[PDB]
């Protein structure tokens, strides 16, 4: 790369719903990310939290017995 006119890019830290991401290698070492969904939080590790599909089923059971 050309000299000057550049960001430093240095080994860094990171935080999330997980714990730590040592990899990084970026400017501004040590970062606090809202939620790294890579550690296992969110969608991956298919939580499917707040599960759904009430719709028919819901009005079905409060109906079969009302």
């Amino acid at each position: 790369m050309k000299e000057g006119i550049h960001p430093k890019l240095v080994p860094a830290r990171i935080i999330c719903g997980c714990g730590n991401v040592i990899e990084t290698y970026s400017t501004k070492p040590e970062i606090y990310v809202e939620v790294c969904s890579k550690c296992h939080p969110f969608y991956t590790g298919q939580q499917r939290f707040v599960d759904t599909e009430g719709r028919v089923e819901r009005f079905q059971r409060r109906y079969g017995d009302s």
């Binding site: 719709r55 028919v56 009005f59 079905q60 409060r62 109906y63 079969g64 009302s66």
Partner: protein, 83 residues
């Protein structure tokens, strides 16, 4: 929203004819005047003819019309825009 439950009110004359169509297992056009009543899950698949005040409108039935009433599928409007 809306409610009424702890009763789930449905008229007879059709409920009897709907049940009498499950046993023997026969699906055919069934005319009614009762839009005051809820629907299925024992009617699911029957072509009930709901009344709109003018004439009976044939209404297909699927397991997602369940929670609602019969009149909700037989409009009393006839609008077709303005001008």
């Amino acid at each position: 929203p809306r409610s009424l439950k702890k009763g789930v009110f449905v008229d007879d004359h059709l409920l009897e004819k709907v049940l009498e169509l499950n046993a023997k297992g026969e699906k055919r056009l069934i005319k009614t005047w009762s839009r005051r009543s809820t629907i299925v899950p024992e009617m699911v698949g029957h072509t009930i003819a709901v009344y709109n005040g003018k004439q009976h409108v044939p209404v297909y039935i699927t397991e997602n019309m369940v929670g609602h009433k019969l009149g909700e599928f037989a409009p009393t409007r006839t609008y077709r825009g303005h001008g």
